[model samples]
Target: ARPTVFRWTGGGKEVYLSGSFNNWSKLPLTRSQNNFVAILDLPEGEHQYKFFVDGQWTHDPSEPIVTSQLGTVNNIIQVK
Candidate 1:
């Protein structure tokens, strides 16, 4: 099984991993890291998520961006 690989280009001051998988958190897993990236082992399906920056819930200003339902649009992922 291979987990999706993601990185944090910005949002170093504040970044988080949230969606249907992991409950949304004011702060994401693992504190903000400069040029930080990680892999996720998510099953095949539509998952919504976003990165929080500077104490603000905003969408990931990166490739493959998505809109938010309430707050900033979270990231979108699908595992095969």
Candidate 2:
């Protein structure tokens, strides 16, 4: 499958996408209207991520709770 595109519409001054797929670095997202958008190309399997909204790091409120480690809980993304 092609890379998945994710959008976060939660209100914030700035938004970033962070995950294991990108070595957990915070990637700044583009603001479109009221939402922040990002494109990620992850391998087939389960991956984890969270959004850095403003200065707060959090899971996507819309995705199911999948796993937690090292004191951080993450939102899951399954690439089939």
Candidate 3:
């Protein structure tokens, strides 16, 4: 099975991918595009993640949200 690809915008801002699959902790994954965009491979499951923009952790404002004490709220996405 191919890993689910997640593309996001990066802006001098380093975003880490945190999810239940990745131990719900920030992981070092990134990509270089014409903006603050990144691509990460995730396994199949319901995962939650957010962005760390300029050292400030945040969630993607374009999707469902979830708040965890680990940091700020995160955008939720399920890998089907």
Instruction: Choose the strongest candidate by lDDT.
Output: 2
Please list the C-alpha lDDT of all candidates, in the order they appear. Answer: 0.64, 0.85, 0.64
On the 0 to 100 scale, the lDDT of residue 71 in model 1 is 53
Instruction: Give the runs in model 2 whose Cα sits over 4 Å from its true position.
Output: none
Residue pairs with backbone atoms closer than 3 Å in model 1 (clashes): 3-40, 16-28, 49-74, 49-75, 50-74, 50-75, 68-73
TM-score of each: 0.69, 0.90, 0.64
Model 3, 1-80: lDDT tens per residue? Answer: 45655555545556666666666676655556644444556667777776656677666676789776765677777777
Model 1: per-residue Cα lDDT over 1-80, one tens digit each: 67776677774554666567677654354543455455677788877776666666655666566656665556777766
Output the number of the TM-score-best candidate.
2
Error of 1 at 2 (Å): 1.2
